[PDB]
Design a protein around this nucleic acid. Structure first.
Length: 196
DNA sequence: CAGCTCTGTACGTGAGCGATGGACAGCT
DNA sequence: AGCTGTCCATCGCTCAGTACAGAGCTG
């Protein structure tokens, strides 16, 4: 990576971008190498996140990973990951690392209490659900889940990973439906709060 | 049996690498 | 004209979770 070794990148981490009073926290899996290199969320040339964010109207202009620190204040959106350690991929992580992450994540969510905890990936919600809700359904679906983060009113919302690795949702366009329904959920919640 | 859970196989786009070679201008 | 190197268009290529079948487990 412009002369930086993988071995160097494996030891970097990616800072969370979290505040109080967020509408949404995007929870990725763990930093990939490019994220680790950049120190910003979803820089992957092919990752669909920033494209989907704009295509859905969650951002009114096309943003990119360099804009990530502006999202809390301007857009009501923050970032963390289920697991902190950088790896060359999401099947390099152990079940223990995942469960440790889940525990850490739920404490972060109990602290910051966003309106909506967004799992950027079905696989990490599968883990979270088992660990936190003691529930594994056989037919986990995308979208809104039926359990709030414990001791909070923060909902859980699941999307197909923005990584372009998965073939079932081959393009940004194939995932945008979930970002639109995420926008609608936020808008609904704000509307309830506004109208009491 | 019937539900699990656990493991390994199989899958579509598009961005951007290095390699290649065509267009072209400088120089003789 | 003949030679040569640069630029750049273009290529083939790689590669950034999910669904599901089947084996194993257990009630």
């Amino acid at each position: 990576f412009n002369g930086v070794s993988e071995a160097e990148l494996l030891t970097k981490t990616l800072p969370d971008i979290l505040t109080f009073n967020l509408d949404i926290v995007i929870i990725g899996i763990n930093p990939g190498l490019m994220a680790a290199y950049k120190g910003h969320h979803y820089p992957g040339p092919g990752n669909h996140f920033w494209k989907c964010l704009f295509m859905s109207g969650l951002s009114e202009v096309q943003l990119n990973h360099m804009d990530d620190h502006t999202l809390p204040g301007k857009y009501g959106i923050g970032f963390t990951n289920m697991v902190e350690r950088t790896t060359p991929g999401s099947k390099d992580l152990s079940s223990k690392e995942f469960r440790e992450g889940g525990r850490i994540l739920v404490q972060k969510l109990q602290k910051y209490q966003p309106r909506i905890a967004v799992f950027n990936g079905k696989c990490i919600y599968e883990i979270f659900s088992k660990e936190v809700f003691g529930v594994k359904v056989k037919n986990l679906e995308f979208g809104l889940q039926p359990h709030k983060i414990p001791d909070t009113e923060t909902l859980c919302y699941v999307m197909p990973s923005s990584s372009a690795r998965c073939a079932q949702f081959p393009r940004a366009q194939d995932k945008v439906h979930y970002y639109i329904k995420l926008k609608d959920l936020r808008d609904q919640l704000k509307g309830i709060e506004r109208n009491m």
